[PDB]
Ligand binder design. Structure first.
Ligand SMILES: O=P(O)(O)OC[C@H]1O[C@H](O)[C@H](O)[C@@H]1O
Ligand SMILES: O=P(O)(O)OC[C@H]1O[C@H](O)[C@H](O)[C@@H]1O
Lengths: 246, 248
């Protein structure tokens, strides 16, 4: 009931292409339903879907697995890491096309990241990802602190997250952190250590869906939309309220 | 006389194997090899044990047939090589509660310095160690004599030129991109070896039970060599191939 109005206002405040706002209070399971449903009406047969990692995207992929088979959707990873995509990929049948960047999410140095990005088998998948028809990503917030997936998964340290925060970052997509206005934070070393597509290349993809909730993400989700990284959103009612007031 | 039971006995004694299965020649073989290798693995793996897997058609067919058993017995899988995508037809068949540990790297780097770098990345080194600690391994065996039909060529991991020179330098086959000569010794002057990300054959031998699954007469010399080098200590093959291996 209050969902339609919040959709409308989100669509107009952030110039979005599509929005779904789910009734408030479990939330992550219900976000995956909402995002799977949006993706079912967006994707045409044999189209390509680029995927990010995290709980909300993995949930979504589970609810979409039957659509993916019967419409022959091709999947491609937006980042390295492999293992982080397996909970969502394991829920598909084995005739599904899945193209996986064969590298770590983050290299121990920027030189090594650049080396890896130039290996043929990595470079091939980076291009495929950038060419996708639709993308589905999660959004992390600095305000989650130890509960953020990117920290639980060991990809950045606590000291890094404190400094990322100090430097004015509010949230991230695929390890790429941006400030409250949506601008990528430029003096953060991790950015040049990530193997996957940068957020500037992600914007090649014409429909880019963020799925994310919890009031603690509101600032990050707003900023993601202000930066243009996502042009469609799936979120929950309380978060929507919080974004609109942010 | 002869038959499969005799061929098993002879192979077992001749190569000092721990386990052997020879399937009849007569309905198509790579599928029946997979069934036979899954049945052997089912009798060797205890619950919660760890199975190291290599890539290729025979291993991926085996894993497909083992998927129900992997699930119910909570078998943990780990990749023996990089490549990620080379393993998807196999691991794609499992359910999502399955424990699957994948080397997050290419199979082969563009240079040896780059391979050495990737082997020292934390997320790669962790999985290399997990693989070496496995209870059982399952691998395919490739033969130089397959030429353009070898999976290692068909998948683009080596060039025709490379395959030619590897043959010139005395290799007969490979396991996981590591090529050995007819006595079973790894061929030392081949640059693909230092470019591979995964475990070398010497570290594969840590795994106590090492099952090769491979058939076709053109692989006979390579399979014999693989047993002579000790890379596999158990074999699943077909009748014709067993006969050829025995006369090698
Ligand atoms: O909170 P989740 O849904 O688990 O996932 C969010 C992560 O996925 C996003 O692209 C960012 O990397 C975040 O770091
Ligand atoms: O002939 P297949 O069963 O497809 O696979 C053999 C390949 O997989 C083996 O370990 C070697 O890499 C071979 O090159």
């Amino acid at each position: 009931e209050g969902c339609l109005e919040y959709e409308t206002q989100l669509r107009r405040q952030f110039s979005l292409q599509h929005v779904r706002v789910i009734p408030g209070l479990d939330v992550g399971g219900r976000l995956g339903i909402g995002a799977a449903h949006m993706l079912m009406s967006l994707l045409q047969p044999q189209q390509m879907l680029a995927i990010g990692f995290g709980e909300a995207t993995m949930n979504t992929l589970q609810r979409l697995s039957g659509f993916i088979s019967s419409q022959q959707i091709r999947l491609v990873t937006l980042s390295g890491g492999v293992g982080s995509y397996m909970t969502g990929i394991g829920q598909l049948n084995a005739a599904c096309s899945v193209n996986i960047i064969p590298a770590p999410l983050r290299a121990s140095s920027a030189d090594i990241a650049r080396t890896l990005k130039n290996e043929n088998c990595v470079k091939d998948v980076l291009l495929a990802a950038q060419a996708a028809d639709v993308a589905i990503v999660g959004i992390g917030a600095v305000s989650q602190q130890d509960d953020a997936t990117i920290i639980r998964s060991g990809y950045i340290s606590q000291g890094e997250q404190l400094m990322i925060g100090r430097k004015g970052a509010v949230g991230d997509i695929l390890g790429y952190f941006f400030d409250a206005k949506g601008d990528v934070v430029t003096n953060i070393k991790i950015h040049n250590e990530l193997i996957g597509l940068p957020l500037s290349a992600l914007k090649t993809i014409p429909v880019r869906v963020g799925v994310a909730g919890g009031e603690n993400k509101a600032e990050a989700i707003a900023a993601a939309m202000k930066g243009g990284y996502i042009n469609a959103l799936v979120t929950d009612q309380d978060t929507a309220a919080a974004i609109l007031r942010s």
